[PDB]
UniProtKB/Swiss-Prot annotation, chain A:
Its EC number is 2.1.1.200. Both the catalytic N-terminal domain and the extensional C-terminal domain play key roles in tRNA binding and methylation. It catalyses: cytidine(32) in tRNA + S-adenosyl-L-methionine = 2'-O-methylcytidine(32) in tRNA + S-adenosyl-L-homocysteine + H(+); uridine(32) in tRNA + S-adenosyl-L-methionine = 2'-O-methyluridine(32) in tRNA + S-adenosyl-L-homocysteine + H(+). This is tRNA (cytidine/uridine-2'-O-)-methyltransferase TrmJ. GO terms for cellular component: cytosol. Changing Y140F: Strong decrease in activity. It comes from the Bacteria. GO terms for molecular function: protein homodimerization activity; RNA binding; tRNA (cytidine(32)/uridine(32)-2'-O)-methyltransferase activity. Its main location: cytoplasm.
Curated annotation (Swiss-Prot), chain B:
The gene is trmJ. Changing R87A: Loss of tRNA binding affinity. Loss of activity. GO terms for biological process: tRNA nucleoside ribose methylation. Its main location: cytoplasm. The lineage of its organism: Bacteria, Pseudomonadati, Pseudomonadota, Gammaproteobacteria, Enterobacterales. Belongs to the class IV-like SAM-binding methyltransferase superfamily. RNA methyltransferase TrmH family. It comes from the Bacteria. It comes from Escherichia coli (strain K12). This is tRNA (cytidine/uridine-2'-O-)-methyltransferase TrmJ. The keyword Ligase does not apply. Homodimer. GO terms for cellular component: cytosol. Its EC number is 2.1.1.200. Both the catalytic N-terminal domain and the extensional C-terminal domain play key roles in tRNA binding and methylation. Keywords: Cytoplasm, Methyltransferase, S-adenosyl-L-methionine, Transferase, tRNA processing. GO terms for molecular function: protein homodimerization activity; RNA binding; tRNA (cytidine(32)/uridine(32)-2'-O)-methyltransferase activity.
Length: 164, 169
């Protein structure tokens, strides 16, 4: 992937993921967009055969994932932290893509995703420079965790492609 | 949803979906973006408990899905048909990216039905199926690993549809 080096500094950080299936789906979503750098903060369960199954061809993303106890560990070294949630500085996914790719050229960037039902807590959201909301149906705005990663990752790759 | 009526004309058409879980996930992806009109063309098995479970709050999109025997049935009365496929040397076809597809889809759906056609897990659409489409849409991806899960591909396409709609506001 010609995009490999441009994107490798972008950390996808999953906070306290409940289901290993979603970790797998996340690794696939990432990998399709060229993202390789997965961080799991205190997952309920560590990745297992169901995560590997759903990762399929991207099981190497799982295999290389950093698993850490605390969010601060996953954010350590990042010049840009973006949290995703359905008063703070807001980006949309397209702007998040553009900003991430530009900052990732130089330094690590963290794109932080929350728990399947709860999302990110207030204390977690206050660690981010920006928040990203994916514009959605107000009747039903909650994407599946992996689907949300796919949207963000997709806009990251579009941003990279524009630099070409 | 303020988008409801502008997006109502857009049909998501899944061809021969194998796994009921994927029908549910697609229903969820669709609903979150304001799309509600799902067509299943010869599904291997009809939506069951697993579709309903993965649909979560979107089980009404499953509930209201049109199930038909032939792709032609799902395209009948559509002025624009877009199918998901990579660029092909074998069968060259005019290509959109998801962004252009959203823009074309929303412009067209303000007036007439539009069909966004997705293929089988793993293998996609046949050439005969692909020749019923005005355009093909290719999601640009990692050359080492360029196939999205069915429901993920729907999520991206639907996302670009809603972004196109949002542009109009
Ligand atoms: N509309 C949306 N915009 C941004 N992120 C979303 C989203 N829907 C889901 N997510 C991501 O998916 C995770 C699980 S959904 C958690 C509940 C709620 N939808 C929320 O966003 O807080 C979220 O923490 C977030 O990282
Ligand atoms: N990179 C991509 N671009 C467009 N659609 C894709 C895609 N990856 C997966 N899909 C969708 O998910 C379904 C199962 S995956 C099969 C991929 C298909 N053979 C192709 O070339 O596009 C496909 O039929 C398609 O609807």
């Amino acid at each position: 992937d010609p995009a490999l080096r441009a994107l490798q500094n972008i950390r996808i950080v999953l906070v306290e993921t409940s289901h290993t299936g979603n970790m797998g789906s996340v690794a696939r979503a990432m990998k399709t967009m060229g993202l390789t750098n997965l961080w799991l903060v205190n997952p309920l369960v560590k990745p297992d055969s169901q995560a590997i199954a759903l990762a399929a061809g991207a099981s190497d993303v799982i295999g290389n994932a950093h698993i850490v106890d605390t969010l601060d560990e996953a954010l350590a070294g990042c010049s840009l932290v973006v949290g995703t949630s359905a008063p703070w500085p807001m980006l949309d996914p397209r702007e998040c893509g553009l900003k991430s790719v530009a900052e990732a050229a130089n330094t690590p960037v963290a794109l932080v995703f929350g728990r399947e039902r709860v999302g990110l807590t207030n204390e977690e959201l206050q660690k981010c420079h920006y928040h990203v909301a994916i514009a959605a149906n107000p009747e039903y705005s909650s994407l599946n965790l992996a689907m949300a990663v796919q949207v963000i990752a997709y806009e990251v790759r579009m941003a990279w492609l524009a630099t070409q």
